[PDB]
Short mmCIF file of all heavy atoms in Angstrom, two decimals:
data_model
loop_
_atom_site.label_atom_id
_atom_site.label_comp_id
_atom_site.label_asym_id
_atom_site.label_seq_id
_atom_site.Cartn_x
_atom_site.Cartn_y
_atom_site.Cartn_z
N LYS A 107 26.36 181.69 77.01
CA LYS A 107 27.23 180.48 77.15
C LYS A 107 28.73 180.91 77.11
O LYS A 107 29.24 181.50 76.15
CB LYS A 107 26.94 179.52 75.98
CG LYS A 107 27.73 178.12 75.97
CD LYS A 107 28.87 178.08 74.92
CE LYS A 107 29.65 176.78 74.99
NZ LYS A 107 30.63 176.65 73.83
N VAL A 108 29.51 180.68 78.18
CA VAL A 108 31.03 180.83 78.16
C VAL A 108 31.73 179.77 77.27
O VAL A 108 31.27 178.63 77.24
CB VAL A 108 31.52 180.92 79.64
CG1 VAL A 108 31.47 179.63 80.50
CG2 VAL A 108 33.00 181.50 79.80
N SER A 109 32.87 180.07 76.57
CA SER A 109 33.51 179.13 75.65
C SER A 109 35.05 179.37 75.57
O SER A 109 35.52 180.47 75.39
CB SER A 109 32.89 179.20 74.28
OG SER A 109 33.19 178.08 73.48
N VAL A 110 35.83 178.30 75.50
CA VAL A 110 37.15 178.29 74.83
C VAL A 110 36.96 178.30 73.20
O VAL A 110 35.95 177.87 72.70
CB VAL A 110 38.07 177.08 75.33
CG1 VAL A 110 37.55 175.67 74.90
CG2 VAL A 110 39.51 177.20 74.98
N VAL A 111 37.99 178.78 72.43
CA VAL A 111 37.94 178.78 71.02
C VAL A 111 38.30 177.36 70.46
O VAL A 111 39.39 176.73 70.89
CB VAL A 111 38.95 179.92 70.40
CG1 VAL A 111 38.85 180.09 68.84
CG2 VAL A 111 38.67 181.34 70.94
N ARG A 112 37.47 176.77 69.64
CA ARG A 112 37.59 175.35 69.22
C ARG A 112 38.17 175.13 67.79
O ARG A 112 37.41 175.21 66.74
CB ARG A 112 36.20 174.61 69.47
CG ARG A 112 36.20 173.13 69.28
CD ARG A 112 36.96 172.20 70.24
NE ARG A 112 38.21 171.74 69.71
CZ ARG A 112 39.46 172.13 70.10
NH1 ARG A 112 39.77 172.93 71.05
NH2 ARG A 112 40.48 171.65 69.38
N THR A 113 39.43 174.85 67.69
CA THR A 113 40.06 174.23 66.49
C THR A 113 39.37 172.90 66.05
O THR A 113 39.27 172.02 66.95
CB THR A 113 41.63 174.13 66.79
OG1 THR A 113 42.01 173.96 68.19
CG2 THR A 113 42.40 173.06 66.03
N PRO A 114 38.95 172.66 64.78
CA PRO A 114 38.18 171.46 64.40
C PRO A 114 38.74 170.02 64.79
O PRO A 114 38.11 169.33 65.52
CB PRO A 114 37.81 171.63 62.92
CG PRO A 114 38.62 172.88 62.46
CD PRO A 114 38.91 173.66 63.75
N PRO A 115 40.01 169.59 64.44
CA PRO A 115 40.73 168.52 65.05
C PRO A 115 41.44 168.93 66.48
O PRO A 115 40.74 169.41 67.41
CB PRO A 115 41.56 168.08 63.86
CG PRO A 115 42.01 169.34 63.20
CD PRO A 115 40.82 170.21 63.33
N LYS A 116 42.79 168.82 66.56
CA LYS A 116 43.59 169.45 67.59
C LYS A 116 45.00 169.92 67.03
O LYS A 116 45.36 169.56 65.92
CB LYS A 116 43.58 168.61 68.87
CG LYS A 116 44.48 167.30 68.89
CD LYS A 116 44.54 166.62 70.21
CE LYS A 116 45.74 165.62 70.35
NZ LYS A 116 47.05 166.36 70.50
N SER A 117 45.86 170.51 67.83
CA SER A 117 47.27 170.64 67.59
C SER A 117 48.07 169.26 67.64
O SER A 117 47.77 168.46 68.53
CB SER A 117 47.88 171.67 68.62
OG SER A 117 49.27 171.92 68.36
N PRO A 118 48.99 168.92 66.75
CA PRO A 118 49.70 167.59 66.71
C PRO A 118 50.83 167.30 67.72
O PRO A 118 51.91 166.81 67.45
CB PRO A 118 50.14 167.49 65.21
CG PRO A 118 50.45 169.01 64.86
CD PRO A 118 49.38 169.77 65.54
N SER A 119 50.57 167.58 69.10
CA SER A 119 51.15 166.87 70.22
C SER A 119 49.98 166.26 70.96
O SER A 119 49.44 166.90 71.96
CB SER A 119 52.01 167.91 70.98
OG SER A 119 52.31 167.36 72.26
N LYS B 132 38.60 191.21 49.83
CA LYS B 132 38.64 191.00 51.34
C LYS B 132 37.82 189.76 51.84
O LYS B 132 37.20 189.01 51.01
CB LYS B 132 38.29 192.41 51.99
CG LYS B 132 36.87 193.05 51.96
CD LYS B 132 35.85 192.30 52.74
CE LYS B 132 34.50 193.00 53.08
NZ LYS B 132 33.63 192.08 53.95
N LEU B 133 37.83 189.48 53.15
CA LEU B 133 37.09 188.24 53.67
C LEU B 133 35.46 188.45 53.81
O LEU B 133 34.91 189.55 53.65
CB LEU B 133 37.70 187.97 55.04
CG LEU B 133 37.37 188.92 56.21
CD1 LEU B 133 36.30 188.34 57.12
CD2 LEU B 133 38.53 189.31 57.11
N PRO B 134 34.64 187.40 54.16
CA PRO B 134 33.12 187.53 54.14
C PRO B 134 32.39 188.34 55.28
O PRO B 134 32.91 188.57 56.34
CB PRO B 134 32.72 186.05 53.96
CG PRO B 134 33.91 185.28 53.56
CD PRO B 134 35.10 186.02 54.26
N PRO B 135 31.10 188.82 55.03
CA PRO B 135 30.31 189.65 55.99
C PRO B 135 29.78 188.81 57.18
O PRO B 135 29.23 187.78 56.96
CB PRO B 135 29.23 190.28 55.02
CG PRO B 135 29.02 189.18 53.98
CD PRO B 135 30.29 188.49 53.75
N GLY B 136 30.06 189.27 58.37
CA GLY B 136 29.82 188.43 59.60
C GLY B 136 30.95 187.50 60.07
O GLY B 136 30.61 186.52 60.73
N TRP B 137 32.24 187.82 59.82
CA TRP B 137 33.34 187.06 60.38
C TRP B 137 34.19 187.75 61.50
O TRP B 137 34.06 188.96 61.78
CB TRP B 137 34.18 186.90 59.06
CG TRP B 137 33.97 185.57 58.41
CD1 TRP B 137 33.10 185.29 57.32
CD2 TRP B 137 34.40 184.31 58.71
NE1 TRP B 137 32.99 183.98 56.96
CE2 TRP B 137 33.78 183.36 57.85
CE3 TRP B 137 35.49 183.90 59.66
CZ2 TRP B 137 34.19 182.04 57.90
CZ3 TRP B 137 35.69 182.48 59.73
CH2 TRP B 137 35.10 181.57 58.89
N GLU B 138 35.19 187.07 62.01
CA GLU B 138 36.43 187.61 62.45
C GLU B 138 37.69 186.66 62.28
O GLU B 138 37.52 185.45 62.09
CB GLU B 138 36.29 188.21 63.97
CG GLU B 138 36.97 189.50 64.29
CD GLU B 138 38.43 189.49 64.64
OE1 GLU B 138 38.78 188.94 65.72
OE2 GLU B 138 39.26 189.90 63.80
N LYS B 139 38.83 187.25 62.36
CA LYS B 139 40.16 186.49 62.38
C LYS B 139 40.74 186.42 63.80
O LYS B 139 41.05 187.43 64.45
CB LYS B 139 41.05 187.02 61.25
CG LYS B 139 41.54 188.48 61.25
CD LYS B 139 42.83 188.71 62.09
CE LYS B 139 42.89 190.16 62.80
NZ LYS B 139 41.91 190.14 63.93
N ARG B 140 40.94 185.22 64.42
CA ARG B 140 41.39 185.06 65.77
C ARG B 140 42.90 184.60 65.74
O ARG B 140 43.39 184.21 64.70
CB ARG B 140 40.59 184.01 66.56
CG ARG B 140 39.06 184.34 66.70
CD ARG B 140 38.74 185.62 67.49
NE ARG B 140 37.25 185.56 67.83
CZ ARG B 140 36.43 186.61 67.76
NH1 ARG B 140 36.78 187.83 67.42
NH2 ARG B 140 35.18 186.44 68.09
N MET B 141 43.60 184.84 66.79
CA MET B 141 45.11 184.67 66.84
C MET B 141 45.63 184.04 68.19
O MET B 141 45.48 184.74 69.26
CB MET B 141 45.74 185.99 66.50
CG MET B 141 46.72 185.80 65.32
SD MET B 141 48.29 185.07 65.83
CE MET B 141 48.22 183.45 65.01
N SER B 142 46.33 182.95 68.16
CA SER B 142 47.23 182.59 69.27
C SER B 142 46.75 182.00 70.64
O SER B 142 45.67 182.49 71.13
CB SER B 142 48.39 183.65 69.43
OG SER B 142 47.93 184.79 70.14
N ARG B 143 47.46 181.13 71.28
CA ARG B 143 47.34 180.84 72.68
C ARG B 143 48.75 180.80 73.45
O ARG B 143 48.95 181.74 74.23
CB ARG B 143 46.63 179.45 72.88
CG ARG B 143 45.14 179.43 72.19
CD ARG B 143 44.41 178.05 72.39
NE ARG B 143 45.08 176.83 71.94
CZ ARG B 143 45.50 176.58 70.74
NH1 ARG B 143 45.48 177.36 69.72
NH2 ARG B 143 45.86 175.25 70.50
N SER B 144 49.60 179.88 73.12
CA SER B 144 51.07 179.98 73.61
C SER B 144 52.06 180.10 72.42
O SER B 144 52.63 181.20 72.23
CB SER B 144 51.29 178.74 74.55
OG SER B 144 51.17 177.49 73.92
N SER B 145 52.29 179.07 71.60
CA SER B 145 53.22 179.08 70.46
C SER B 145 52.90 180.01 69.21
O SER B 145 53.65 179.94 68.26
CB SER B 145 53.50 177.60 70.10
OG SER B 145 54.46 177.54 69.03
N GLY B 146 51.79 180.72 69.14
CA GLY B 146 51.42 181.49 67.97
C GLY B 146 50.48 180.72 66.89
O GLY B 146 50.87 180.67 65.81
N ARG B 147 49.34 180.18 67.37
CA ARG B 147 48.43 179.48 66.56
C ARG B 147 46.92 179.85 66.84
O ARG B 147 46.41 179.86 67.94
CB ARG B 147 48.58 177.95 66.52
CG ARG B 147 49.82 177.39 65.81
CD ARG B 147 51.05 177.31 66.84
NE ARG B 147 52.30 176.72 66.28
CZ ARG B 147 53.22 177.43 65.70
NH1 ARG B 147 53.09 178.66 65.43
NH2 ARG B 147 54.31 176.82 65.38
N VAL B 148 46.24 179.96 65.77
CA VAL B 148 44.72 180.25 65.57
C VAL B 148 44.50 181.34 64.53
O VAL B 148 45.37 182.24 64.26
CB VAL B 148 43.71 180.05 66.70
CG1 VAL B 148 43.46 181.17 67.70
CG2 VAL B 148 42.28 179.57 66.23
N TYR B 149 43.34 181.35 63.77
CA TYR B 149 43.18 182.08 62.48
C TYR B 149 41.86 182.82 62.19
O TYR B 149 41.88 183.90 61.74
CB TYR B 149 43.60 181.21 61.24
CG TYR B 149 45.07 180.73 61.30
CD1 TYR B 149 45.32 179.41 61.72
CD2 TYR B 149 46.09 181.61 61.27
CE1 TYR B 149 46.48 179.10 62.45
CE2 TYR B 149 47.29 181.40 61.93
CZ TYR B 149 47.50 180.07 62.48
OH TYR B 149 48.68 179.83 63.11
N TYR B 150 40.72 182.15 62.50
CA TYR B 150 39.39 182.50 62.03
C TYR B 150 38.23 182.06 62.94
O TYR B 150 38.23 181.01 63.62
CB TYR B 150 39.36 182.06 60.52
CG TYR B 150 39.83 183.02 59.43
CD1 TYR B 150 41.13 182.82 58.83
CD2 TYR B 150 39.06 184.07 58.92
CE1 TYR B 150 41.62 183.61 57.88
CE2 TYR B 150 39.61 184.92 57.91
CZ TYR B 150 40.83 184.62 57.41
OH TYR B 150 41.36 185.50 56.37
N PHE B 151 37.13 182.83 62.93
CA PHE B 151 35.90 182.52 63.73
C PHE B 151 34.66 183.22 63.00
O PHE B 151 34.66 184.43 62.82
CB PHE B 151 36.09 183.09 65.12
CG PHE B 151 34.94 183.03 66.14
CD1 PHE B 151 34.91 182.10 67.22
CD2 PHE B 151 33.91 183.94 66.08
CE1 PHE B 151 33.87 182.05 68.12
CE2 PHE B 151 32.84 183.86 66.97
CZ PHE B 151 32.82 182.95 68.04
N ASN B 152 33.61 182.45 62.58
CA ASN B 152 32.38 183.06 62.03
C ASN B 152 31.54 183.70 63.18
O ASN B 152 31.14 183.02 64.12
CB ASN B 152 31.68 181.99 61.15
CG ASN B 152 30.78 182.43 60.01
OD1 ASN B 152 30.66 181.78 59.00
ND2 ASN B 152 30.06 183.54 60.08
N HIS B 153 31.10 184.99 63.03
CA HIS B 153 30.38 185.77 64.10
C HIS B 153 28.88 185.61 64.02
O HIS B 153 28.19 185.34 65.04
CB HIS B 153 30.83 187.26 64.05
CG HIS B 153 31.45 187.76 65.35
ND1 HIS B 153 30.73 188.33 66.34
CD2 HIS B 153 32.77 187.68 65.68
CE1 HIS B 153 31.72 188.62 67.23
NE2 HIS B 153 32.97 188.23 66.99
N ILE B 154 28.20 185.74 62.86
CA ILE B 154 26.74 185.45 62.59
C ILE B 154 26.30 183.99 62.82
O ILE B 154 25.31 183.79 63.51
CB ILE B 154 26.33 186.09 61.22
CG1 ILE B 154 27.12 185.43 60.00
CG2 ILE B 154 26.30 187.57 61.20
CD1 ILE B 154 26.72 185.92 58.61
N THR B 155 27.08 182.99 62.34
CA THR B 155 26.91 181.57 62.78
C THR B 155 27.28 181.24 64.25
O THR B 155 26.58 180.53 64.97
CB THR B 155 27.76 180.74 61.81
OG1 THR B 155 27.19 180.82 60.49
CG2 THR B 155 27.89 179.25 62.06
N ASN B 156 28.44 181.80 64.71
CA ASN B 156 29.19 181.38 65.99
C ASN B 156 29.91 180.04 65.83
O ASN B 156 29.54 179.01 66.51
CB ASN B 156 28.37 181.67 67.29
CG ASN B 156 27.88 183.01 67.57
OD1 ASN B 156 28.60 183.84 68.09
ND2 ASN B 156 26.67 183.40 67.19
N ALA B 157 30.99 180.04 65.07
CA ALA B 157 31.84 178.80 64.88
C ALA B 157 33.35 179.15 64.84
O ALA B 157 33.82 180.02 64.06
CB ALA B 157 31.42 178.17 63.50
N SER B 158 34.13 178.50 65.66
CA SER B 158 35.64 178.68 65.69
C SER B 158 36.30 177.75 64.63
O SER B 158 35.94 176.60 64.43
CB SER B 158 36.17 178.32 67.06
OG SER B 158 35.57 179.06 68.10
N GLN B 159 37.37 178.24 63.88
CA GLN B 159 38.27 177.28 63.08
C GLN B 159 39.67 177.81 63.00
O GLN B 159 40.15 178.89 63.48
CB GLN B 159 37.57 176.99 61.77
CG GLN B 159 37.65 178.05 60.71
CD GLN B 159 37.17 177.59 59.24
OE1 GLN B 159 36.15 177.92 58.75
NE2 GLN B 159 38.14 176.88 58.56
N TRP B 160 40.55 176.91 62.47
CA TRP B 160 41.97 177.31 62.11
C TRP B 160 42.26 177.41 60.56
O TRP B 160 43.30 177.07 60.10
CB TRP B 160 42.93 176.46 62.97
CG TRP B 160 43.27 175.00 62.67
CD1 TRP B 160 42.46 174.04 61.99
CD2 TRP B 160 44.37 174.26 63.21
NE1 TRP B 160 42.96 172.76 62.07
CE2 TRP B 160 44.18 172.91 62.75
CE3 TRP B 160 45.44 174.63 63.98
CZ2 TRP B 160 45.06 171.94 63.25
CZ3 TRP B 160 46.34 173.64 64.43
CH2 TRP B 160 46.12 172.32 64.05
N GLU B 161 41.31 177.98 59.74
CA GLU B 161 41.46 178.25 58.39
C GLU B 161 40.48 179.40 57.92
O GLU B 161 39.44 179.72 58.54
CB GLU B 161 41.11 176.92 57.52
CG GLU B 161 42.14 176.65 56.40
CD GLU B 161 42.26 177.63 55.21
OE1 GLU B 161 42.96 178.68 55.43
OE2 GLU B 161 41.67 177.47 54.17
N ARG B 162 40.82 179.99 56.80
CA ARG B 162 39.80 180.83 55.96
C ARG B 162 38.50 180.08 55.56
O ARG B 162 38.48 178.86 55.45
CB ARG B 162 40.75 181.18 54.79
CG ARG B 162 40.19 182.09 53.67
CD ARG B 162 41.24 182.25 52.54
NE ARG B 162 40.65 182.37 51.13
CZ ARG B 162 40.27 183.46 50.55
NH1 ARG B 162 40.39 184.69 51.09
NH2 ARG B 162 39.75 183.35 49.35
N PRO B 163 37.30 180.75 55.24
CA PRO B 163 36.22 180.10 54.51
C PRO B 163 36.41 179.49 53.05
O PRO B 163 35.49 179.34 52.35
CB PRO B 163 35.14 181.29 54.43
CG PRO B 163 35.85 182.54 54.94
CD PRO B 163 37.16 182.16 55.67
N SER B 164 37.69 179.23 52.72
CA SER B 164 38.08 178.81 51.33
C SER B 164 37.90 179.91 50.19
O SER B 164 38.87 180.52 49.80
CB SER B 164 37.57 177.39 50.97
OG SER B 164 38.21 176.81 49.79
N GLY B 165 36.64 180.15 49.72
CA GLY B 165 36.33 181.29 48.80
C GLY B 165 37.15 181.47 47.50
O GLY B 165 37.63 182.59 47.24
N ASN B 166 37.29 180.39 46.64
CA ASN B 166 38.16 180.46 45.41
C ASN B 166 37.37 179.61 44.28
O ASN B 166 37.48 178.42 44.32
CB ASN B 166 39.53 180.00 45.70
CG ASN B 166 40.52 181.01 46.33
OD1 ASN B 166 40.57 181.13 47.53
ND2 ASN B 166 41.24 181.69 45.52
N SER B 167 36.68 180.30 43.37
CA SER B 167 35.90 179.61 42.25
C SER B 167 36.77 178.89 41.17
O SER B 167 37.91 179.24 40.91
CB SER B 167 34.96 180.67 41.69
OG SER B 167 33.85 180.95 42.49
N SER B 168 36.16 177.85 40.49
CA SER B 168 36.79 177.18 39.38
C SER B 168 35.76 176.71 38.30
O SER B 168 35.77 177.05 37.19
CB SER B 168 37.75 176.07 39.83
OG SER B 168 38.91 176.65 40.45
N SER B 169 34.72 175.78 38.73
CA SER B 169 33.56 175.55 37.94
C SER B 169 32.27 175.75 38.84
O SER B 169 31.67 174.81 39.30
CB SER B 169 33.69 174.05 37.35
OG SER B 169 33.57 173.10 38.38
N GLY B 170 31.98 177.03 39.11
CA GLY B 170 31.37 177.43 40.36
C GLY B 170 32.39 178.13 41.27
O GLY B 170 32.11 179.23 41.79
#
């Protein structure tokens, strides 16, 4: 499986 | 030191990203915590 790296919420913009 | 089966990841544009578990396969932006008190 190919993937981006997943931060649990997101960055705040 | 940190736990068996990890890595520490870094950055995309502005300099952000921290940690990824290798044996599980999970990305995050923190350490595994790892600091005892009652347990």
Side-chain angles (χ1 to χ4, degrees):
Chain A
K107 181 260 179 174
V108 71
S109 198
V110 72
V111 185
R112 188 67 257 112
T113 31
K116 73 171 199 76
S117 188
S119 165
Chain B
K132 70 68 166 184
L133 75 98
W137 264 96
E138 218 279 288
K139 64 85 210 75
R140 298 300 193 221
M141 235 282 113
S142 80
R143 300 180 307 301
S144 64
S145 183
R147 292 89 178 88
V148 87
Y149 304 95
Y150 276 99
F151 175 106
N152 207 145
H153 239 269
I154 57 178
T155 295
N156 300 277
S158 303
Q159 75 170 108
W160 79 333
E161 227 296 78
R162 183 182 145 92
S164 194
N166 280 87
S167 284
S168 291
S169 70

